[PDB]
């Protein structure tokens, strides 16, 4: 339709923003513990999928918790300590989150450049309708 | 009459595009006020009803925020660009149609 380009770019921007927000939240909760109701904090990731309308935009179905084992730290003085006196610290890969943020920023800038070019082309298109 | 009927659809499309532009401007200007809900209108249904005040409905939130605001900047910007381009196209179509109607008189 020559106008689904805007939809594709907007979906890409929204997905990149979601992924960046997830990475930022993980970085903020890198060294947290004992969230609400006492359950240990676990990191989360996002999964990108394409919308087969062929070629289509990107979407994020749901946020998936990481299955990597939590860090078990010996500290009996914490009420969260089990019979072995261990507390469950969250699994956060700082380098992984930095790389994810870098990738999200680069994809966002590429998509905004594509939007700029297509907007210029579409503005120039209407000059022939007169 | 006939002259008004030939242009009613394009004129109403232009007017609805202007109103939706105003709605988008308002809900992008209120991007920081907590407790403010995003607003927009169903363009196709509105145009069909008017061709046969203005009804507006809330937007589905994208991500939660503690303050309460539910406006997404990139989505609003894309909608703004789309509506602006479609308004420009409608204006061009109306101008061409009027130019042809004027030209037929010579």
């Amino acid at each position: 339709a020559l106008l689904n380009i805007f939809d594709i770019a907007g979906s890409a921007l929204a997905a990149q923003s979601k992924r960046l927000n997830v990475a930022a939240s993980n970085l903020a909760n890198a060294d947290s513990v004992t969230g609400p109701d006492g359950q240990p904090y676990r990191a989360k990731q996002v999964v990108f999928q394409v919308d087969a309308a062929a070629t289509g935009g990107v979407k994020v179905a749901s946020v998936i918790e990481s299955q990597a084992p939590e860090k078990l730290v010996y500290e009996p003085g914490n009420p969260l300590a089990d019979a072995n006196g261990y507390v469950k610290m969250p699994n956060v890969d700082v380098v992984g989150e930095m790389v994810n943020t870098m990738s999200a920023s680069r994809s966002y800038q590429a998509n905004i450049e594509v939007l700029n070019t297509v907007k210029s082309m579409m503005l120039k298109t209407l000059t022939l309708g007169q | 009459d006939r002259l008004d009927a030939a242009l009613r659809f394009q004129q109403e499309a232009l007017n609805l595009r202007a109103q939706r532009q105003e709605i988008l401007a308002a809900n992008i200007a209120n991007a920081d006020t907590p407790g403010y809900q995003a607003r927009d209108i169903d363009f196709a249904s509105e145009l069909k009803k008017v061709m046969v005040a203005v009804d507006l409905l809330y937007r589905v939130p994208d991500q939660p925020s503690l303050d309460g605001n539910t406006v997404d900047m990139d989505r609003e910007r894309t909608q703004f660009a789309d509506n602006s381009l479609k308004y420009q196209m409608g204006l061009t179509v109306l101008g061409s149609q009027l130019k042809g109607m004027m030209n037929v008189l010579q």
Partner: peptide, 21 residues
């Protein structure tokens, strides 16, 4: 449903409980 669509009713207000009630 899908984010960014049109809904006739507002979403419930957001809250961030520090501790569960």
């Amino acid at each position: 449903g899908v984010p960014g669509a049109l809904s006739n009713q507002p979403a419930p207000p957001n809250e961030a409980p520090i501790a569960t009630p």
